Amino acid sequence: ADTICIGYHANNSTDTVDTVLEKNVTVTHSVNLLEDSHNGKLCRLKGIAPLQLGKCNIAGWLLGNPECDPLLPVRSWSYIVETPNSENGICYPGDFIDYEELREQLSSVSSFERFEIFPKESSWPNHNTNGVTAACSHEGKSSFYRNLLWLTEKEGSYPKLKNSYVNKKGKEVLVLWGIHHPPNSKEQQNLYQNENAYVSVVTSNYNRRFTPEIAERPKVRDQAGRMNYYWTLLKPGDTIIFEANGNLIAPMYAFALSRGFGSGIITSNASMHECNTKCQTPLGAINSSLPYQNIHPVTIGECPKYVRSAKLRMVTGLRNIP
């Protein structure tokens, strides 16, 4: 006699999923939700290449450490890459004050204009501007930071100075400067004339007076003196004023900042290729529609959500029983 049977699909699938009641159920159809593949490359993001600091770090870059000269013309970037070798930073020893905050600020900068805030020949008429140091050597000559200017006595005198810059860039301007602390009083006298010298820096939302601390520190890069490095953000339309009768390492170049969201600083061992991505990790770029990934918690762009999971597979079909 004739028959009809009701039944369900089976196929050759070997994919498995877990449920709460049962592990490793073989199923006819399923989909992986966890991305574990990346291309092992640093890529452009939305077309724009990252800034590779190489053997330089952020401090070497923004002060203009002469070892970092290849970075000087770069104006825009999609993220910033340091490496475990990013070591060339300050070259004349001292401390960089609020460095972590500066790195945090830079993480939302997408481009800047490097400009001459105090032109070297016209800004400091009665001071020498040519001071260099063997601690910042370049091509076998004593040199100095490309964005700062060492002011010293001229003809035996270091008269009180006052210079100011009005921010007409329509953008925040990042100003860096330094304070020099000689190791002894004759260096103080030789460099700056005035034994009891001061520096002050003033904006509408920043004010600090600096007094040098004369003392012999252990030698670092052959230097017994020290140089501390400072920064502030000058708001649009504000004025910054520098006053000193010694010890000021003056700004020469500053940075008009353009903000963007989604940038950041990462550390990476990967190599730059000519590729483009929507999602970069320090291990490689991700090109995926999957909702989750277990590749890396550090992400630039628009990336799957990081989880610690080893497997996330959703069944769509049914128990496979061929």
């Binding site: 006699a1 004739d2 028959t3 009809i4 049977c5 009701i6 039944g7 369900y8 699909h9 089976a10 196929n11 050759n12 999923v17 877990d18 449920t19 709460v20 009641l21 159920v25 199923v27 006819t28 989909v31 939700l33 993220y79 460095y99 972590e100 790195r103 945090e104 993480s107 969201f261 989604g262 950041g264 600083i265 990462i266 550390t267 999957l290 909702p291 989750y292 918690p297 550090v298 992400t299 630039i300 762009g301 628009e302 990336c303 799957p304 959500k305 990081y306 989880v307 610690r308 999971s309 996330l312 597979r313 959703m314 069944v315 769509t316 049914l318 128990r319 496979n320 029983i321 061929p322």
Partner: protein, 170 residues
């Protein structure tokens, strides 16, 4: 499974039914063959794909997330930042895995239910014009050619039409 059909009273699946998840195998004088049930297959694909979309919609992206730095006298702040990062990661890893486990259980049960309901639907059309023979199969008490078979498959089987001939046979 919860509805007793898949890996249950229908013991195995059919590699020969290649055009949907649920359907029919028939045998009559004219031949034998497989045919998916198109309505339940299509409704189930609609449901399952909506479920995937819903899962994906609720969590599928993170925007730029980069490390922060702390100086030697900011260890409390550094530990606080790490507590936040580790704690959110614990929660999202838990959420993602458990959502998939729970939805997987529900998906398999949904397929089982659809097979069970297709079986009961045929059963209630045939009534005593056929006998239940095991393993999801019915044996007709009348000749059921391909037009008759298609009417079972599309839910328009005409019990009075065959009931006299069935009655004589059983």
């Amino acid at each position: 499974g919860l509805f007793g059909a898949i890996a249950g009273f229908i013991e195995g699946g059919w590699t020969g039914m290649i055009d949907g998840w649920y359907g029919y195998h028939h045998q009559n004088e004219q031949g034998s063959g497989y045919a998916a049930d198109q309505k339940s297959t299509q409704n189930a694909i609609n449901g399952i794909t909506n479920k995937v979309n819903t899962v994906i919609e609720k969590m599928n992206i993170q925007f730029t997330a980069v490390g922060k730095e702390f100086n030697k006298l900011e260890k409390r702040m550094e530990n606080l930042n790490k507590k936040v990062d580790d704690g959110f990661l614990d929660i999202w890893t838990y959420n993602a895995e458990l959502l998939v486990l729970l939805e997987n259980e529900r998906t398999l049960d949904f397929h089982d239910s659809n097979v069970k309901n297709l079986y009961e639907k045929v059963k209630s059309q045939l009534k005593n014009n056929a006998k239940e023979i095991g393993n999801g199969c019915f044996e007709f008490y009348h000749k059921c050619d391909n037009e008759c078979m298609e009417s079972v498959r599309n839910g328009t089987y005409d019990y009075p039409k065959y009931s006299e001939e069935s009655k004589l046979n059983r």
